[PDB]
Write a protein that binds this ligand. Structure first.
Ligand SMILES: *[C@@H]1O[C@H](CO[C@H]2O[C@@H](C)[C@@H](O)[C@@H](O)[C@@H]2O)[C@@H](O[C@@H]2O[C@H](CO)[C@@H](O)[C@H](O)[C@H]2NC(C)=O)[C@H](O)[C@H]1NC(C)=O
Ligand SMILES: *[C@@H]1O[C@H](CO[C@H]2O[C@@H](C)[C@@H](O)[C@@H](O)[C@@H]2O)[C@@H](O[C@@H]2O[C@H](CO)[C@@H](O)[C@H](O)[C@H]2NC(C)=O)[C@H](O)[C@H]1NC(C)=O
Ligand SMILES: *[C@@H]1O[C@H](CO[C@H]2O[C@@H](C)[C@@H](O)[C@@H](O)[C@@H]2O)[C@@H](O[C@@H]2O[C@H](CO)[C@@H](O)[C@H](O)[C@H]2NC(C)=O)[C@H](O)[C@H]1NC(C)=O
Ligand SMILES: [K+]
Ligand SMILES: [K+]
Ligand SMILES: [K+]
Ligand code: NA
Lengths: 410, 410, 410
C-alpha cells in the first residue's frame, strides 16, 4: 500500500493557515532582498525574523572547447618538372599544414612545356593551394547543456539555509517555499559560442558552425582544436593548368578564395551578440551572469509562520549508492551512461531520482521506482571533462568515488 | 450585453474558502500520487476521499516520415568509343540509380585517343560517377509539431475524471483545479530525428538535414523516401578527362568522395542524442516518454471541499458542427486549412475555439467570436497522415465526419 | 541600512486578507473579460465594480528588412576573339548585374580555333554566366528580437488603468495584480521571415537563409536589399571550353543551374508556415496577433478589496536621466550601447533598471545599483531603425532627447 515519492519539490498548504505570499516578476539580472519581522496577530509579543536573499540568475553551460578559429590567406603556387613522378619531388607547400595539391602527372605536351622540355607524357606539373598568414581570431565552444539558476538564501528565526535553485525548481523548508518559474530562448544546444578576445564582456552565437563538412569560407572553417595541429577545411573548387608553347604551366583555382572569418566579418550584423558578467571558465564548462535586463523570471514565496508546510517529498526511505560502470564520453552531445548500484531500505518501494554528479554539479538524472534491497540504475548524462569522476547521487548524498568517461572525437 | 467566452480554462476562487493547495516542481519523467481524506474542520463526521494521479510527461510529435538514410560508396568509371554519339551507347552505371555522367562528345584527339582510334572530333568518352554498396543506416523524421502533456486523474468523493492535460493548460472540476506550467527546449520544429536501429532507446537530432539542396556528404544526402526509389544527392565537383598518346582516356573527379553518413560518424560527438521510453509510432506521429530526469515542470493543485469553484468558462451556448471543405496537406510544415460550418444557439455571441481533430488528437485551432446562427470558421492545422479525416470540433464534441488533406511533396 | 529595489514587479499579500483569485490558462489568440460587483461580506451596502479586460497576445519582432528575394534563370554565353586581351572587348553580359566570367586569354590553339583564326597563344575566349528573367518573389526580414505581450485594462471602483504587459511580467496596482506566464517556441532570433505577397495572411520561416556565403540555389541566394542593386550569389562550379577544329569554342558550366526559389518551391512542405492577423509593419519592426489557437499562456489575477497589497517595488528614490553617447548599430544582431547619465536623489542607493527606449518601445535594459548623485550607466540594446532616437528611461519616464545609432552592413 505505501508508495513513497520524493520527486515532488514543493508543499501542501491550507490557504487560511498561510500568513504571507510574495508573487512577482523579477529582472533576471537583479538580486532581490526581503526583510520582515513576523509578529503574532496582535495576539502576542514574540516576533520571528524573516530574511530572504535571491541572487541574480546565473547561466551554466556545459560545452566542448573547440579551440581557436583562424583567419588566413589562401595562396596558390605552381611547381614544374620535365621528368619524374610526383612523389620524387618535394613541393614548397609540403610544410604548410593546410594544402590542396593537383598533380598533372605524365601529361607533358608540346604547347604546354617550357622551352627546355621536349617531354611528352612525362614528368609532373604541380598546382598547390596552401593557407598562410594564419592568425587566431577567437575561441569557440560547442553548447552541450544550458541551465539557469538563482542562489536562494532563507532565514526564518534561527533556521538558515541557502540553496542553488534551478529555474523551474523550488526551495522547500518547513516555513518557507520559494519557486522560480521561467523560460529563456537565447541559447540553444548545439549553438557554438565565439569569444573574440579576453571577452569577459561578450561573444557571438553561431547557429551553423561547420561540423561534418568544413569548406574554406564557412564559419569555423580553420580550427586548431589544441595548441598544435589544424583541422583543415576542404577546397571544393577546381584547378586549371593553363598551358602555353615554350612556357611553364601556370595553375589557377576557381573556388572561393575568402576566409570564413572575413566572410563573417563582412556581414557581422547578421549574427547575434550576447554579453556576460562575472564569467568563470572551467574545463568544458562556462558560467556567467547574463546582464540582459530585458529578461525576467517569476518568483513565488509562501510563508507559514506557525504550522509547518506538508513537504510533498517527505519519506522514510534510505538510500545507499555506489558506481558500477560507465560508458560514453564527456564533452559530447551523445553523452555517457553511468550505471549505479542503489540499495533501498526502510520502504518496499521508493519513487525518486538518481543523479550523475561531480563537485556538486549534476550532469544527468534518472527517475526510478526502487524496490527494497539492491537496484541497478542507469543514468544518462552529458558534459564534464577528462578529470570528471561521475558519481551516483541521491539528493545531496553521493557515492564515495566516481568514474571517468571517455574522450570525444577520438 | 452578454459576452460568453470558454477560452479560459480555470477557476475563480475565494482564498478563504479554499481548503488545500499543492504547489511543486515535478520531475518530468515522474508520476505523482496524492491521497487524502478531507475532513470537516473538527466540525463533523463526514470525510471526502481525494485521490489525484498525475502521469509522466509524454511528448507527441507530428512528423513527416522521410524514409531511410543510406551509407554508400562513390565509384568512378570511364567508357570510351571511337565513333558515335553518347546516346548510341549504354553505360555500365545506367542501372545505377544515383549517377553523374560527363560526356566528352565529338572531342577525340591525337594525344588522347587509344592506338586503334584515328578519330578526331568524333565518338565519345564517358566519365561516370555512381553510388554503390548502399546500406540503410537509419530512419528519419521531420518534426512538424511538438506538444507535451500529462494524463491527470482526479477523484473527489464519487466524482472521478481523467483528462490528458497539455503543458500550460489546466484540469478544471467543481472542487479541484490542476494546472501544469512548463517549458522544454530540447526539440524544435524543423529538426530532423534519426533513429539508427529498433531504437526504442533513443536517436539523434539534426538541425541541418538537407532539404532544398542535398550534396553528397551532407546529413540526409542519400534518402529513400519509401521502399523503392532514391532521392539522389548532387555531385558538385568537376570531372577531368586525363589524356595520353595511344592511351584510353581516364576520368577523375575532384569533388567530395565521402558519404554524409561517414562524415557525420566521424564527428558524431558534435550531434545531440535523445533517449526515449515506451515509444508509439503511428503514421506521421511519434509519441514517447522522455526519461531525461533533469527536466521538470510546475504543478498547482487547488481544492475547495465545500463551495464550488467559479468555472471561468461556464456558459449556456450550444454549438453544432460540420466540415465544409479542406485545402492543404498532411505531413507538411505549411499545413492545411479546414473550413467548418458552426451553428450557435442559446447566445447572441460566443467567444470560443473551434478545432481540427481526429481520433482525439487535435491538429489546429481557431479562436472565434461566433454569432447566433450559422458561422463559417477556418481552422489552420499541421500534421496527420493520408488516412486522417480532419473533423471540426468544439471541446470534446466533434462533427460526424472529417475530411482528408492532400499529400505533401507531390 | 536601506536597500531600495524596484526590479520586483509584484505584491506581498496576506492570504486571509485577499478576496478573489482568478487562475487560468487562456488561448493566446483570445481576449478575456471579467466583470463583477465586489460586495462587503453581507456586512454592508457598498459595492465596488471590478472590470478586467485582457487583450489577445501580440507579437512584436524587431527585424532587419533584407529587401526582396528573386527568382531568375542562369544563362550561359560564349564570346570569341582571335586577337586582343580580354579587357579590350565588351561582353554581352556586362550589363547583367549578376554574372560570372571565365577568360581563356592568350590560349588560341589549332584544334580549338575557328576557320578564320590562325592564332596561337593569342586573343580571348569568354565563357559568361548571367542571371536574367529576374522576378521578386517575396520580402525577407531577419529576426533580431521577439517579445510577446497582452494589453491589460483594470477598473477597480473609480481607479482605471491600462498597461501593455509583457509575457512573464506583472500588472501591479493597489487592489489588483495580473501576472502573465508563458512560453512560445515558434520563432527564434536569427530566423528569416519570408512574406510572398501582401501577406497580411502569413509567411514562411527559414532557419538557414544564406548570410556569409550565398551560392546560387540557396534560400536567399538572389537579394536586392533596396530598390536597386543586387547582392549576387556565388557560382561555385567550373567552366569548360569545349574545343573543336575550325570551330568556335563553346562554354559549359558544371555547377547548379536551379535557382534557390525553385529549389525551395520544389520541397516547400519542408518549411514552416505561420499565419498573421492585424499586422503592422513599421521601419525595422513587425507586430501582429498570431491566430494559432493551439497556443496558450497562464493568467493569474489576485484582488484585495479592502487593504492594499504591499507593492514590492515601492520606494522613495527619484531619478533624473539624460543620454551621454551611443555606439553600435540599429537593424543589427550585434546591437548598440547607449550611455546614460543618471542622477539619484532621496536614497543612498537604488537597485533598478535603466532602459533604452523610443516612442514607448524598449530595446534594451541594464539592472544597476545606483549611488546617490551622478551615475554612468551603459545599456546594451538591439533593434530600431535609422530614425530611432534611443532615450534613457526609468519606468515610464524618459530623457528629453535620444540618440541615433549607426546603420548596419556598411
Ligand atoms: C540512452 O541512449 C544511450 C545512447 O545510445 C544510443 O544513442 C542513439 C543516438 C543511437 O545511436 C542508438 O543507436 C544508441 O544506442 C544508450 O547507451 C548506449 O547503449 C548501447 C547498447 O547497450 C551501447 O552499445 C552504447 O555504448 C551506449 N552508449 C552510451 C553513451 O551509454 C542507452 O542505453 C539509452 N538508455 C538509457 C537508459 O540510458
Ligand atoms: C493562413 O495561412 C494559410 C497558408 O497560405 C499561405 O502560406 C504562406 C506561407 C504564404 O505562402 C502565403 O502566400 C499563403 O497564402 C492560408 O491558406 C491559403 O490561402 C490561399 C488563398 O486563399 C490559398 O490559395 C491556399 O491554397 C491556402 N492554403 C492552405 C494550406 O489552406 C490561410 O488563408 C491563412 N489564414 C487562415 C485563417 O488560415
Ligand atoms: C556588451 O557587448 C558589447 C558588444 O561588443 C562585443 O561584441 C562581441 C560580439 C565581441 O565582438 C566583443 O569583442 C565586443 O567587444 C560591448 O560594446 C563594445 O565595446 C567595445 C570596447 O569598448 C567597443 O569597441 C565597441 O564599439 C562596443 N560596441 C557596441 C555596439 O557598443 C559592451 O561593452 C559590452 N558591455 C556592455 C555593458 O554593454
Ligand atoms: K576540389
Ligand atoms: K558537378
Ligand atoms: K566557380
Ligand atoms: Na569544379
Amino acid at each position: 500500500t505505501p508508495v513513497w515519492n520524493d520527486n515532488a519539490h514543493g508543499v501542501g498548504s491550507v490557504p487560511m493557515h498561510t500568513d504571507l505570499e510574495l508573487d512577482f516578476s523579477l529582472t533576471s539580472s537583479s538580486k532581490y532582498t526581503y526583510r520582515r519581522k513576523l509578529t503574532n496577530p496582535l495576539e502576542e509579543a514574540q516576533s520571528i525574523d524573516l530574511h530572504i536573499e535571491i541572487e541574480e540568475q546565473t547561466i551554466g553551460v556545459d560545452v566542448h572547447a573547440l579551440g581557436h578559429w583562424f583567419d588566413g590567406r589562401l595562396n596558390l603556387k605552381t611547381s614544374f618538372h620535365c621528368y619524374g613522378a610526383c612523389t620524387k619531388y618535394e613541393y614548397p607547400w609540403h610544410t604548410a599544414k593546410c594544402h590542396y595539391e593537383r598533380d598533372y602527372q605524365y601529361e607533358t605536351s608540346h604547347g604546354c612545356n617550357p622551352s627546355d622540355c621536349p617531354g611528352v607524357g612525362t614528368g609532373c606539373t604541380a598546382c598547390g593551394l596552401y593557407l598562410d598568414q594564419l592568425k587566431p581570431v577567437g575561441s569557440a565552444y560547442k553548447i552541450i547543456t544550458i541551465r539557469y539558476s538563482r542562489r536562494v538564501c532563507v532565514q526564518f528565526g534561527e533556521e538558515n539555509l541557502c540553496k542553488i535553485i534551478d529555474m523551474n525548481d523550488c526551495f522547500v523548508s518547513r516555513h518557507v517555499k520559494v519557486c522560480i518559474i521561467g523560460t529563456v530562448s537565447k541559447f540553444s544546444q548545439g549553438d557554438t559560442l565565439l569569444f573574440f578576445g579576453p571577452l569577459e564582456g561578450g561573444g557571438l552565437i553561431f547557429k551553423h558552425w561547420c561540423t561534418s563538412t568544413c569548406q574554406f569560407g564557412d564559419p569555423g572553417d580553420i580550427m586548431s582544436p589544441r595548441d598544435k595541429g589544424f583541422l583543415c577545411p576542404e577546397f571544393p573548387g577546381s584547378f586549371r593548368k593553363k598551358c602555353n608553347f615554350a612556357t611553364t604551366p601556370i595553375c589557377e583555382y576557381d573556388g572561393n578564395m575568402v576566409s570564413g572569418y572575413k566572410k563573417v566579418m563582412a556581414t557581422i550584423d547578421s549574427f547575434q551578440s550576447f554579453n556576460t558578467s562575472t564569467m568563470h571558465f572551467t574545463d568544458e564548462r562556462i558560467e556567467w551572469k547574463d546582464p540582459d535586463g530585458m529578461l525576467r523570471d517569476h518568483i513565488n514565496i509562501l510563508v507559514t509562520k506557525d504550522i509547518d508546510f506538508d513537504n510533498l517529498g517527505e519519506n522514510p526511505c534510505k538510500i545507499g549508492l555506489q558506481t558500477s560502470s560507465i560508458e560514453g564520453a564527456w564533452g559530447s552531445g551523445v553523452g555517457f551512461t553511468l550505471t549505479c548500484l542503489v540499495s533501498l531500505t526502510e520502504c518496499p518501494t521508493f519513487l525518486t531520482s538518481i543523479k550523475a554528479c561531480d563537485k556538486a554539479i549534476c550532469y544527468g538524472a534518472e527517475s526510478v521506482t526502487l524496490t527494497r534491497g539492491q537496484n541497478t540504475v542507469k543514468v544518462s548524462g552529458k558534459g564534464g571533462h577528462s578529470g570528471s569522476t561521475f558519481r551516483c547521487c541521491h539528493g545531496e548524498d553521493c557515492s564515495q568515488i566516481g568514474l571517468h568517461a571517455a574522450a570525444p572525437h577520438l
